[PDB]
Amino acid sequence: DVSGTVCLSALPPEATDTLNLIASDGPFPYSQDGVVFQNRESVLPTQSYGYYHEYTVITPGAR
Amino acid sequence: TRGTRRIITGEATQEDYYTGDHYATFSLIDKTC
Numbered sequence: 001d002v003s004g005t006v007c008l009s010a011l012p013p014e015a016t017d018t019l020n021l022i023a024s025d026g027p028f029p030y031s032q033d034g035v036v037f038q039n040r041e042s043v044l045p046t047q048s049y050g051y052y053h054e055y056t057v058i059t060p061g062a063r
Numbered sequence: 064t065r066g067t068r069r070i071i072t073g074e075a076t077q078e079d080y081y082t083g084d085h086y087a088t089f090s091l092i093d094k095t096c
Contacts, residue, residue, distance in 0.1 A: 002080070002089055002090065002091055003088050003089065003090050004090055004091070005090060005091040005092075005093045006081060006090040006091070006092060006093065007093050007096035008092055008093065008094050008095075008096070009096060011081055011092070012068065014068070015068075015070065015081060015092075018070050019070070019079070019094075022070070022072060022079075030065060037071050037086075041086070043086065043087075043088070043089055044071065044073075044080065044089060047073070047074075051073060051074055052071050052072065052073060053071070053072050054069055054070075054071055055069065055070045055071075055072070056065055056068070056069060057068035057069060057070060057081075058065070058066075058068075059065070059066030059067070059068055062064065062065050062066035063065070
């Protein structure tokens with residue numbers, strides 16, 4: 001289940017950085033950025049393999 | 064390690080999800096507020 005709908009202004013400013021890099025296809029800060037997300041727990045609606053992709057939102061001080 | 068925050072994209076117009084807890088829960092992102 002998806003837990004409602006959160007304003008972009010209520011998220012960390014680093015989330016806006018991630019959205020800007022998704023639009024330009026990078027360059028990305030982490031190796032795992034752009035890989036397929038499997039959705040193996042069915043939290044999101046079921047879709048084909050390759051429908052969903054994952055990207056890091058940086059946490060300041062976490063390298 | 065890089066912390067627990069991520070965005071997942073789907074294929075549809077503005078279909079983006081935020082997680083703060085390494086995929087345990089998700090919310091749809093409203094880019095208009």
